[PDB]
Amino acid sequence: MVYSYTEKKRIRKDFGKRPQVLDVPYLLSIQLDSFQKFIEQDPEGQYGLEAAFRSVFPIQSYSGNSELQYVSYRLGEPVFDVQECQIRGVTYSAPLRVKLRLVIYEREAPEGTVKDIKEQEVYMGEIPLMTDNGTFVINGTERVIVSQLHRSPGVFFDSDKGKTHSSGKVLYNARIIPYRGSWLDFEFDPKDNLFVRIDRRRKLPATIILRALNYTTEQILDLFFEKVIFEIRDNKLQMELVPERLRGETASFDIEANGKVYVEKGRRITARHIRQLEKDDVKLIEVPVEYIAGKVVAKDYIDESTGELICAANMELSLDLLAKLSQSGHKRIETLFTNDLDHGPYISETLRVDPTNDRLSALVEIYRMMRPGEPPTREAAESLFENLFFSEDRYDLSAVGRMKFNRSLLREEIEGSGILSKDDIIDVMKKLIDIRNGKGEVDDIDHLGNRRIRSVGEMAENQFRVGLVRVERAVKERLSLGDLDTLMPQDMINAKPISAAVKEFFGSSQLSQFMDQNNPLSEITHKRRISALGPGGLTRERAGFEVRDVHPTHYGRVCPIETPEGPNIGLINSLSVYAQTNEYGFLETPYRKVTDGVVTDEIHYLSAIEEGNYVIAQANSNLDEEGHFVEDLVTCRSKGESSLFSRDQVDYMDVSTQQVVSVGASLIPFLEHDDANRALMGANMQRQAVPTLRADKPLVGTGMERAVAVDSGVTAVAKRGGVVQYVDASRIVIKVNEDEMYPGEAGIDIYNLTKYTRSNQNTCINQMPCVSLGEPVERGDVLADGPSTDLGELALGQNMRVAFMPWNGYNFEDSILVSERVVQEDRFTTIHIQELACVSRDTKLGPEEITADIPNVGEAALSKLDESGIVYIGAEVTGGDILVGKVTPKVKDSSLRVPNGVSGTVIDVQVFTRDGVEKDKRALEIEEMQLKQAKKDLSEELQILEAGLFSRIRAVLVAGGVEAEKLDKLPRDRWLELGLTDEEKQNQLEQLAEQYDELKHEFEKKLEAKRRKITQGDDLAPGVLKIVKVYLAVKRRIQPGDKMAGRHGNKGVISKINPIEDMPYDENGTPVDIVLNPLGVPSRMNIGQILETHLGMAAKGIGDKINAMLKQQQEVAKLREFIQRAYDLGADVRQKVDLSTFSDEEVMRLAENLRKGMPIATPVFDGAKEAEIKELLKLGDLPTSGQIRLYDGRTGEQFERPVTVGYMYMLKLNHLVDDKMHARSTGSYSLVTQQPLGGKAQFGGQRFGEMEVWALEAYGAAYTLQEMLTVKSDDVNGRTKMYKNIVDGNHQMEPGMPESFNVLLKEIRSLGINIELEDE
Amino acid sequence: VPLDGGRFATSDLNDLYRRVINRNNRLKRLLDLAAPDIIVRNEKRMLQEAVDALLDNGRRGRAITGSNKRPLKSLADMIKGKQGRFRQNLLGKRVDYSGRSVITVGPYLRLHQCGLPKKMALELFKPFIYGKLELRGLATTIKAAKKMVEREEAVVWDILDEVIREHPVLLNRAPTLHRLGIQAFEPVLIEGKAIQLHPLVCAAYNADFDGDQMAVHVPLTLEAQLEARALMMSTNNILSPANGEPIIVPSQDVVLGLYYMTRDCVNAKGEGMVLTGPKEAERLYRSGLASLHARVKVRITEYEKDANGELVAKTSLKDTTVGRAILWMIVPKGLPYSIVNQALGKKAISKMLNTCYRILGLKPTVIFADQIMYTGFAYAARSGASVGIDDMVIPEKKHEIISEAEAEVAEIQEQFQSGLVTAGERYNKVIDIWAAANDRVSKAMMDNLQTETVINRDGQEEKQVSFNSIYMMADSGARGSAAQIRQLAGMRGLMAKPDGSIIETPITANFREGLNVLQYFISTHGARKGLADTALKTANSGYLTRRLVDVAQDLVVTEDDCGTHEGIMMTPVIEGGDVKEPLRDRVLGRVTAEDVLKPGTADILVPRNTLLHEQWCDLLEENSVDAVKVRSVVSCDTDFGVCAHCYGRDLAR
DNA sequence: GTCCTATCGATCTTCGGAAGAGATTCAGAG
DNA sequence: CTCTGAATCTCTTCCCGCGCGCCGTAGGAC
Ligand SMILES: [Mg+2]
Ligand SMILES: [Zn+2]
C-alpha cells in the first residue's frame, strides 16, 4: 500500500466499504477531449476542422470551369499565452493557415492545368483555443462553453391521446430529423388517410412523394400491399385463398369444396380449419360474387382491342365491371388483401385525397405549396425538390443520424450515406403503417438514447461551417467572373466571414457562458453542465413536465439531484461523476462485467440503449472475496423496471455507489439520508461558497475533495518530480530529478503563482505554497493551494462548532445565531477585489490627458495621486477619491472617482497605451516590474547552465591535465589563458568557452524577445488613447444579514452577532460558536445533517486526544499507537494504513496536521453506520450519546436535557448583505420618462410594481397610492414642490399628472389616433 | 443618446422613420420625374411596406431587423403589454425614497415596530433631516445641511431619532399576493445593515428568514402617514382578509415553548404542593424548587365581563401545574382559565388567541400576542429542545412486518408463477399488501414514540405522554406532523413513476436509516416532480390573479342597502354522505334575505335584514334550521356597484 | 481611411408550445 | 346552390421583484 507525498500528510480516515474498482475519470475530459477532437486534423476525415473543410472543398463554378481545393491546414502557436493574454485583454487564439490550391483548367482540351497555384497557406482566421483548464479566454474574460443536449438525428415515431381530437383514439406520426437540412413529418389524418409535410408547412397527401419519385400507382400498390388473385377457370372467377388470411374474423359466407367443409357461414376460423384448408390444397376456391364485388384492383386494365380503359390500379370493382373486363379477355384479375385489423387500406385512402395524376402534377403541387408566388417549371421544380432530400448542400444525416436511422429500420449495417433514398423513405412509411396496423411500438421521446450531447468541439465545428458557407458564396462568384490569370488564393478568400462566424459564437452565443469562477467547485460543475437550451434546442419558457422530469435512463448518466431549481429545472442537468460521451455523442457509463457467477473486475461502458438489453445489479450487492455474490438473490434494474433476480442470472453490476450522482452532490456526506429537496439545495449551495480568508478542510467529507481540488486545475500541480529548490509564496521552483528531465534542459521548473486577483465574481484567488524548502515532491503532488483548498483538499467553508437548540428566538424560523468569537477569529472574512477603469480618448474636441493639474480641485483631494495622475499603490480609498486624474479639452475634470458607497485598499494598477504614444513613470514603474521578473527567472537558468559548464571545464582539468597552481579565485573563462599546451585539453577549453559564449548568445536573444513583449504597447480599441485600471481590495467581514449555509441545504441569514459571554457553554466551559435551530431537521427531512454533526464531533475528539499528546511531550511510539488505533477503527473498512512505515518524521508531520481534528471520509452511499460513529466517539473520550449538557451564559443555569453539540461545516455564501443593502432619497431620473433609475450600480428607486398597487387599493389607502405613483415618482413639478415642502416641513403635496402618462398620449397621438384629454 | 465614446445608441424609431423618409424622398422624386407605372408601383409598395414597419413592425409577413435578426421595436410595440407603457410605466412605476435589504429576525420588537439600519434611515429621510437642521437653525440651509449630513456629525443622530421618532415606514416583500403583503411599521434604529422584522409577522409575508430581501418605502405627506397608521399598521391587521382566521398564528418555536411549559410530567421535583398564586409559582420555578411541568394546586383568580360588559372577578382553588400557573399570568384579565388549563399546541393556542379577540377586542389582543411570543421563546430556550439521532425511534416490529408482508406478496407472485391470477390483479393487489404493511409500520411507530416514556410513581412504573424530542414537535404542531415523522423513522412507503402509476416495490426504508442507490434514485421522481410543479405553477397562478383583479377592479361598495328582498339560500354542503361543511361556515355574517322563522311555523326568529353575527349563528345552531336565505352581491340591485348590506361582514373587521 | 448609403430586386428566418379563441373554409342537403 | 354544421389558419397570452455578467451598423467607393 502506498500514499503520495501529499496524501501522506493528512490521511483522511475512510469509512467506505465497497472496494472502488474504477478510479474517477479526470473530471473535465468531457470538455478537453471534445475540443481536442475539433482541433486535431484526422485523415479519416470525420470530426474536426478538416471534416468541415472537406464538407465544402473542392469548390468551383461550372461557368468558371476551374476550382480551388483544400490540401491541408496548419495551426500556428498562439500569439499570446493565456496569462499574458488575460492581462492584455485580448482573446487567446491561434492563427489558422490553409493550403489552398487554385486549379486553372482550359476549354476544349482535357482538363490538364494551364497553371495551379498552391498559395503558401492562406490565412483563414483566428480560432480561439481551449486552456488546459477547459476554459476559453475571450476578452480577457474567461468563458466556458456548456455542452448542449438535444434530439439526435434519426427517425422517430410518436403518438398521443386527448392532445388530438380526444374521441378515445390516438394519431401516429413519423419524423425524419437530419442533422442539417429539412425535417419530414408523416402523419395520418384521423380517418387513417396518410399525409406528409416538410418543415411543418402545410399538410400534403403522402403519396405525393411516391408520385414525385415516379412510381405509378400500380407500383406503389406493389410496394405496400399483398396480392389476392382471381383465376377465371374450372368455373367463372375462382379465387386464390391464402389460408392464413382468415383467422379470428367471422366466416360470414359460403366457402367449401371437395369433402369436409373447413368453416361454414357465420363462424370464426381457427388453426385446425386452416390445416384442413392446407391439406385440401385450397389453391383455388369458389366464392360468391359479393366477395369479388368488394375488391379494389391492383393493376391497370385497358381493353387491348379498343385500346381503351376499363379499370385502373386502385380502382374499385363491381360484378358488371368484372364481367366486361374478363369478357374482354383479361382472364387473371388481380386485387389487394385488406383485412381491417392487419392490413388497413391507408394508401388507397390516400389516393382518394390525391389531386395529383403523376410525377409532374405532384411536383407542381410541391412547388406551389412550398414557394407560393413563384412559377412551377419543369426545369426549375427539381431545383427545389432535390435540394430537399437528395443534395449535400442542404440535406445531411451525419454518421450518427444514419446510424440511428438504420438501427430503427432494423438494418444490418450503419456505414451509410448521409442523404436519403427512395427506399429509405419507403421503409419509413412501411414502418409507420405497421404501427397503425397495430404490430409495432412508438419511441419514448425523452430518453437518453434519443438525445445526444453536443459539446464545444461540435458546436464550433458547425459555426465554422457557417463560415465556410459564406465564403463559398463569395468565392464561387469571384472565381466564375474572374480572369483566373492574376487571381491567387489569398485574393480568392478573405477571413472576415469565418472570423465573424466563430468570434460571434465564442463571444455571444447563448452557450458561451461567462465562467462562474466562484470557487474550485463552481468552476468544475460549470464546465460539465448539460444544457437543453440554446441554438437548435427548446426554450426555458416553452417546455413542461415531459422533459423537466427525470427518466429511468438518467441513472448513472445524469445526476438527478443537482439541477438548478427555478424556471429551468431539468433543462439544465449535471453530467454525473463517472459518465462519459460515447463516440457518437450518446451518454454512456461504465459497468462491471458479471461473468457467469463472479464479478470480473473489467468495465464495459454502456450507452442508454445497450443497457435495456441486460439485467444489472445495484452497486451495494455484497461479494465473497472470490467475487461471487453473497446473497442468493439480488436487486437489479432491467428495463427501467427493478426487482430481485437470481445470483448468476444477473449480467452487469454498477461500478460504484457514487455512480448515480454529480461531483456537486457527491461532496455531501451522508447523502444517503436526505430528502432530495434538501439534497438539491445542498448541491446547489456548495457552488456558491465564497473562498474565505484562511480556508482549511472539511472534517467530514467524501474523499471527492482530493479529486475536485486537483482536477479543477486551480491548485498548482507538479509537472515533474524533483526537490523544492526555493519557495517564497510567489514562486515555487523545483529541481526536477534527472529520471524525468529532458537532456538539454537546465532542469528547473518554476511555478509563478497567481496572487491576489479578481475572480470573475470578484472573490480573490491567491495561491499559497504547501511545500517547504528542500522537501521532495512527486509528479502530480499539489505544490500550492488554490483558493478554497488546503493541502489539496477542497475546503469551501469552516468547520464551525454548532449546537442545535432554540435561543430566545434569535435563531427563529431559519436564522443562525453566531458568537463574536467566530468573527474575531477571522473565520469568515473574505476579500473582494473590484476593478475600476478610466479610459481616455482622441475625442472630437481633441485629446485627453491624465494629470494632477486637474482644474477646479485642490490638494485636499489630490493628496493621494502621485505626480503622474494615478493613485499610489497602497492608498486606502473611499467614496469620491480621485483614482485617476483624467481631463478633457474645451478643460473638463472628467477623472475616475471611486463610486459612492464602496471602499477599499488599492492593491494594483495597470496601464495600457496605443502605438505611437508616450509612456509615463507609472508605465515605467510597471515595465520595471515586469522586465525584472522575466530577467530573474531567465537568469536562474543561465546561471545554472553556466555553473554546470564551468564544472565541465574544472572537472576534466582537475581529474587530469591539471593546471591548478591557482584555480578558483580566477574568472572561470579566463582559465583559458593559462599556458596549457596544444594537447586536446586546450582544444576542449577553447570549444567549451565557445559553448559558453553561445550559451550567453542564447539568452541574448531570449531576453530580447521577452523584453520586446513588455516594451510594446497594446491593441487598444479605436478612439482610445490609453486606459488605466485600478483595483480595490476590500476585506469584508461578517455581520447580521449575511447568508450562511450548510452542505445539506440548510441555510439562513445570520441574525445576531452574540458576544461570547452569551453563548451557551458546556461543563468544561467552552462556548458554542453557532446556534442552529432544531425544527428545520424534521420539518424538512434533511437529517443527514445530524450525523455530520456527530461524526464531526468525533473528528474533533481524535484531534483533541492528539493535541493533548503533543502538548504533553509524548514519545512518537506512543503517539503512533494512538493514531494507528484511530485508522484501524470500525468494521472491514476499505482503507488500510501502516504508520509503522512512516519513519517517525512523517508521523510527527502527520500529527501536526491532525491536531485540530482527524479528517474523515464518508463516501456518499457507503458511509459510517451509527455503530461506527459511536465506536469512534468512544475512542475519543467523548459521550457516545453525542449530546452534552449545556448552561446558559446569561445566568449559568443548566438547560433541561442535553443538546447536540458538534462540528458542522458551514459555507459563507455569496449573497452577503452589504452587497445588497440599498436606499435612495433622490438622484437620477430616466430621460424618456422621468421615473427614477433602477439599480444599485445606479442609485435607483425600488419598483412599486403592479402588484403593490393592487395591494394599496385593497386597503382604503388612496392618498398613499396617489403619492407613490406621482409625487414620489413622475410628476416633474410636484416632486420638486414636494421636496421643498418637506424641507420646510409643511407635509403637504400638489399632485398634478404624471409625465409618463403624457408620454403615452403622444405615443398614441403618434399613431393617427387622436386621443385627447376632455373637459366635462 | 451617446454611449461609450463617440457612438449613438441605436435608437430604434429613428431607424424606422429613416426608412420612411428615404422612401418618401424617392417617391416624390420618381413622381415628379414621372416614372412609369412599374417603377412607381415598386416604390409605392416599398413605402407602404415601410410605414407598415413604423406603426406595428411584424404584423407584416416578417419583422424587419438591423442586427442578428433582432426585430426593431415599433410604436405599437412601445404601447402594448409587458414591456410597454401600460404595464411597465403607468400602472406601476419606480419610486424615490425607498430602499431594500435582507431581512433578519428581531425577537425583541413589539409587534408594531421594525428595526431598520441607521445608514438607510439617514439616506432615506434626508429631506426631513434638512427640515430639522434649518428648524434648529443649526445649518444655514440645504447647502450647509447637505455637508453637515455628509460629514455624519455627532448631532445628526439625535436629530434623526427625532425625525423618525414616529414616522411609519411601509415594508413589503415581492411578490405581494394580498393586502397583508404591504404593511406599515414604526421604525427603530439599528447598527447593522439588515432590516429587523418582527417574528410573528413574517408568516403574513411568507417571509422566510433564509436571506429573503424586502423593500421599504417612506410615506412622505401627512395624509400618507394618517393612512399608514390607521389602516396598514400591523396592529390593525390581526385578521385575514379572506377568512375569519387570525394571521398572527404562532410561530413554530413559540408554540413549542408553550407546549413544553404546559405539559404534565407525573414525576417531578416539588410535585403536589399548594400555592397562593402565580407569583410564588414563579418564585418556586425560578429558584429551582419546582419543575415547570410539575403538578400542583393553586389559588387562582379569573375575570368575566357580565351581560352589561363589566367585570366580575372570581377566585378559587384550581388544580393545575406550575407552568400553567405561570402562563396564566400573561393572559389579560377577562378570559377564563379553562383556556389555559391544558397542554397547549398550535391549534389550541390559535383558538386561545382567537378567543381573546372574541372577548376583549383588538387592543388587548395585540399585546397578549406579543407576550405569548416572548414567553414561548423564553421557555423554549430553557427547554433545550434539541434534536438528536438517538431520538429517532424505529419500532422493531417493522422488521417482522416486512418479513411477513414480503411472503404474502410472494403468494400473489406464486399464483402469477402458476398463471392463477391476472396481470392486472397481481399488481393492484400487491400494492395493497404494501399499503397494509405501511399502515402497520406507521401505527407501530406512533405507538412506539408514545411508548418510550414510562416512569416510577414513587412505587411501580406508570406511563405518560412522551417527552421524546421529535414527538414534542409533532404533538405540539410546531412543524413536521405525521407525514414527516412517518418518513423519518417509520417507512417512506410507496413511490410513484413519472406518469403517476405506482411502484411495485416500495421504499421500505426511512431517513433515519440509509436509502440504497435505487431507493434514492426513485425518490427523486417524487421530488423533482414537486419542484417542477412549483416552478411551472408560479406563472399560471400569477396570470390567474391578474385576470381576476383586472376584472373585479370596477366594484366598490357604494350604497348602504340596495333595497332588495331577493337573495340565495345556504345549507351545509351535504355530499358523499356526511356534511363537508356546516352552516356556520357559510352563513355567518351575511345578512338575512327574508324573515327567518323558527323551525316549524309562524314563529319568526330573525328579522328580515339582520346581520347574522356570531351570537345569531350560535342561536341558529341551537335550532333545527337547515336552509337560510341571505343577500349576495350577485343579487344586489345597485347600479354601478354593490350595496353594503348585500356584501355583509367585512372579514377583516 | 473616411464618408455615405443601404438591406437575398440570383436566400431560406427552425421544427421541441398549448391553448384557446376567433376568421375564415368547406360538408349533406332542401 | 348556398344554408348551418364542422375544419384549418393566425393571433394572443403565459408571476413579481432583484442582482449581477457582457455586447451594442456594415460595405463600398472615392
Ligand atoms: Mg426564503
Ligand atoms: Zn344590495
UniProtKB/Swiss-Prot annotation, chain A:
GO terms for molecular function: DNA binding; DNA-directed RNA polymerase activity; ribonucleoside binding. PROSITE patterns: RNA_POL_BETA. InterPro entries: DNA-dir_RNA_pol_bsu_ext_1_sf, DNA-dir_RNA_pol_bsu_external_1, DNA-dir_RNA_pol_su2, DNA-dir_RNAP_su2_dom, DNA-dir_RNAP_su2_hyb_sf, RNA_pol_bsu_bac, RNA_pol_bsu_CS, RNA_pol_bsu_protrusion. It catalyses: RNA(n) + a ribonucleoside 5'-triphosphate = RNA(n+1) + diphosphate. The keyword Transferase applies. Transmembrane segments: none annotated. The modification N6-acetyllysine is found at K1000, K1178. One of its GO terms (cellular component) is DNA-directed RNA polymerase complex. Disulfide bonds: none annotated. Keywords: Acetylation, DNA-directed RNA polymerase, Nucleotidyltransferase, Transcription, Transferase. One of its GO terms (biological process) is DNA-templated transcription. Its EC number is 2.7.7.6. The keyword Transcription applies. DNA-dependent RNA polymerase catalyzes the transcription of DNA into RNA using the four ribonucleoside triphosphates as substrates. Belongs to the RNA polymerase beta chain family. The RNAP catalytic core consists of 2 alpha, 1 beta, 1 beta' and 1 omega subunit. When a sigma factor is associated with the core the holoenzyme is formed, which can initiate transcription. This is DNA-directed RNA polymerase subunit beta. It comes from Escherichia coli O157:H7. The lineage of its organism: Bacteria, Pseudomonadati, Pseudomonadota, Gammaproteobacteria, Enterobacterales. The gene is rpoB.
Curated annotation (Swiss-Prot), chain B:
It comes from the Bacteria. The RNAP catalytic core consists of 2 alpha, 1 beta, 1 beta' and 1 omega subunit. When a sigma factor is associated with the core the holoenzyme is formed, which can initiate transcription. This is DNA-directed RNA polymerase subunit beta'. Zn(2+) 2 binds at C562, C636, C643, C646. Belongs to the RNA polymerase beta' chain family. The keyword DNA-binding does not apply. Keywords: Acetylation, DNA-directed RNA polymerase, Magnesium, Metal-binding, Nucleotidyltransferase, Transcription, Transferase, Zinc. Mg(2+) binds at D208, D210, D212. GO terms for biological process: DNA-templated transcription. DNA-dependent RNA polymerase catalyzes the transcription of DNA into RNA using the four ribonucleoside triphosphates as substrates. The chain holds residues 253 to 905 of 1407 of the full protein. GO terms for molecular function: DNA binding; DNA-directed RNA polymerase activity; magnesium ion binding; zinc ion binding. GO terms for cellular component: DNA-directed RNA polymerase complex.
